[PDB]
Design a protein around this ligand. Sequence first.
Ligand SMILES: Nc1ncc2c(ncn2[C@H]2O[C@H](COP(=O)(O)O)[C@@H](O)[C@H]2O)n1
Ligand SMILES: Nc1ncc2c(ncn2[C@H]2O[C@H](COP(=O)(O)O)[C@@H](O)[C@H]2O)n1
Ligand SMILES: O=C(O)c1cccnc1
Ligand SMILES: O=C(O)c1cccnc1
Lengths: 342, 342
Amino acid sequence: LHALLRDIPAPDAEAMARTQQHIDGLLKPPGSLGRLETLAVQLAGMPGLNGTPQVGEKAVLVMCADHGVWDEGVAVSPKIVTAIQAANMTRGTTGVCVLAAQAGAKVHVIDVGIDAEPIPGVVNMRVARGCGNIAVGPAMSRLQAEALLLEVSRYTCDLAQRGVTLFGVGELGMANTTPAAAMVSVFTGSDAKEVVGIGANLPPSRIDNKVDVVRRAIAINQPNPRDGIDVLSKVGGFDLVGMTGVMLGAARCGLPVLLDGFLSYSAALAACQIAPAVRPYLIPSHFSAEKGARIALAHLSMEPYLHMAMRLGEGSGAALAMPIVEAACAMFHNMGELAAIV
Amino acid sequence: LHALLRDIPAPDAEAMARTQQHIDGLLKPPGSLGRLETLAVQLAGMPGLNGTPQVGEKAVLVMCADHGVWDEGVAVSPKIVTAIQAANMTRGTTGVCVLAAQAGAKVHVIDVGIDAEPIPGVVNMRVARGCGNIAVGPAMSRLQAEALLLEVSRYTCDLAQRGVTLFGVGELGMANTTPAAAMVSVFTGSDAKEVVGIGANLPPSRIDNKVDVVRRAIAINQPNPRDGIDVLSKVGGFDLVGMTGVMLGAARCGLPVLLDGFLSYSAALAACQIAPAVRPYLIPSHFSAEKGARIALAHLSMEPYLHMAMRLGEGSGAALAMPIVEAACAMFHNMGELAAIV
Ligand SMILES: Nc1ncc2c(ncn2[C@H]2O[C@H](COP(=O)(O)O)[C@@H](O)[C@H]2O)n1
Ligand SMILES: Nc1ncc2c(ncn2[C@H]2O[C@H](COP(=O)(O)O)[C@@H](O)[C@H]2O)n1
Ligand SMILES: O=C(O)c1cccnc1
Ligand SMILES: O=C(O)c1cccnc1
C-alpha cells in the first residue's frame, strides 16, 4: 500500500498550459465558459488522459455493505433492503442504473460486506457479513481496511486498462449515513449535531438518538484525525472504505473520479488525508441535501456543479454529472478558433 | 396578440397528481431524488407533453440583433462581431452549437435585427438594421415590439408541430447586456449599479460609463414597469424581444422552455409581466456570472440547477441543461417500483 500511495502521479503542468492556451483561443470571449474551462484544464493535467481532455468508457462503482450500527436504530429501512437493492442493481431498475444508462456509463456492483448470501452477478469482495457496530467498538481492524483499500484500488485501475477513463463512485448500505457523519465530525472537527442528517427519511423524532450514537462511536473509538486509515477502520464501514479505494485507485491510474453525495464526501475526506496527491483527480458532481454537506464540502474546498437537492446515493449524482465532463471535452475539441476576430 | 395571451393553457393538475403518485412509488426513498422529481412533475403538467414527462426533438433558438447603444462605448467588441458570430452559428463552430450537438439539439439562428447584409442560412425576421440607441430614445416602437412577439411566437409553436417538445432560448448581439441591465433595473426596482455587469469582458475602468448609460436610458424613456411591452420597446432590443416571444410561443403551445443566462432572465421578467401564465413553462438552467444575476433570479423566484460561472450567452447554458431534463424523464419512465419493500 505504501508503494501504491508513493506512485500516484502529480498533474502534468505542461499539458495543462497547452490546454489553457488552446481554450483561450476559442471562438468566445476569454474565460466566458467559466468552470467548464477550468474542468477541461483539470482533465488535461491527468496523465491517464494522454495530455488532452477526453472521455472514453465510463463506469460507476457501487460499493455495498451492511453496518452493525443499524442495531442502534439509526435507519428506518430493514437491514435486508441493502441486499434487495444490490440485486436490483443487476436488473437495471435502480436510480443509479437509469441515470448511468442515460449517460452511457456501465455500473459495477461490488459487495464488500453485505449481511446476506452472495448475490449472483455482483462482484464478490466481501470482508465480512456486515462491519462491527461502531457504537461499541471499531467497524473493522486496520489490517482489514488496508487490505480492502488495496483490493479495490487494483480493481479500479485494472478497469482503466479496458478503456475506462472516467469513474463515478457510489454506495449502498442501510444506516451508512451514521458512520459517514462520524467521519465528517472527526475530520472537520465539527460537532456531531452539526453534521448528522436525516439520511434516508429518518423521522425528526429519531435524530437525537442518531446524534448520540455518533458521539458514542467517537468517544469509544478515539479515532486519530491525522490518520485516515485509523478513522476509516474505527468509525467507518466497508462501503466507505471501498469508495476511498476507488479514489486512490483512479488517482494512481492518473484518471478522474466523479464524487457523488454525502457518503462520498466522507470517503474523499479520508482519501485526501491518506494521500494529498489524490485531490487533483477528484471532481465534484452535486450538492447533497444531507445536513453535513456544506461542512464536508468546505473542508474539501469543493463547489459542486449541480444543485438538485438530491439525497439518494448509489452514485446517482456522479452519473448525472458525466454529461458535464463530456461537454467540457466537446467544447475543447469542437469549437472553432478566434484566429480563424480580436 | 391578445388572443395569443388569452389562449395560454393552465397546467394540468390531474396529470401532475398522477405523476407525483407514480414517482413516490419508485424504487427509492420518497423524495430522495429532490429537484429531479419536482422537474418531472412540472413537465407532466404541460399540456403539450401529453400528460407525461417526455422529451422528443430539442431546439435552441438564437435571436440575433445589433443595438444602437453600442455607440455609447458599452461593449469592447466591434459591432461586426454580431454578424460574424451569426455566420459561425451556421458552421457549427460556436459554443452553443457544440453544446447543442452534444445534447442532440438543433440550433435555429434567427436574425431579428443584425446591422449587416443578410446572412445565408440564417432565418430572416429582421425588423431593422439594429435597434435605436436607448440612451437617447426608445429601441423601437410599441408596434414593432408587438409584431415581433407575434411573429416569433408563431414560429416557435409551428416547430412544435414538427416534433420539437423542448426549447432553449439564446441570443447574439454586441452590447446587449446593457439593455438587459436596464430592463432588470426597471422590473426589479433595483439601482443600475447593482445590476450592471462586465458583459463580455468589459474593462473595470469602463463600468462607470455603462452604469451611467443605463440610468440615462431609463430617465429619458420613462418605461412603465407594469407594462412589459412598454419596457421592452423602450429600453430593450430586438434580440431581447425575440427571446420573450419564444417564451410566449412555447407556453401557448403548452411546452417547456429552458432559460439561459442574464439576457434570458431579463426576457423572462418581461414575459411574466406580460402574461403570468407563462411562468409554469419556464425552466432555469444555470446561474450566470453576470453581476445582476442573483437579483433577476430572485424576482423570478428561480433557483438554477447548474453553477458553472458561465457568461457566454448564445443559449449555451440552456443546451447544457437539456440532459438534466432528459434524466428526469428517464427516472420517471425507467425506474422500477417499490411494490415490485415498504
Ligand atoms: N430503498 C432504498 N433505501 C435507501 C437507499 C436506496 N438507495 C440508496 N439509499 C441510501 O440510503 C442509505 C443511507 O441512509 P440511512 O443512513 O438513513 O440508512 C444508503 O443505502 C444510501 O445508499 N434505496
Ligand atoms: N465573440 C463573442 N463575443 C461576445 C459573445 C459571443 N457569444 C456570445 N456573446 C455574448 O456577449 C454579448 C453581450 O456582452 P456585451 O454587452 O459586453 O457586448 C452578446 O453577444 C452575448 O451573446 N462571442
Ligand atoms: O448524499 C447522499 O449520497 C445521501 C444522502 C442521504 C441518504 N443517502 C445518500
Ligand atoms: O449570462 C449570459 O448569458 C451572458 C453574460 C455576459 C455576456 N454574455 C452573456
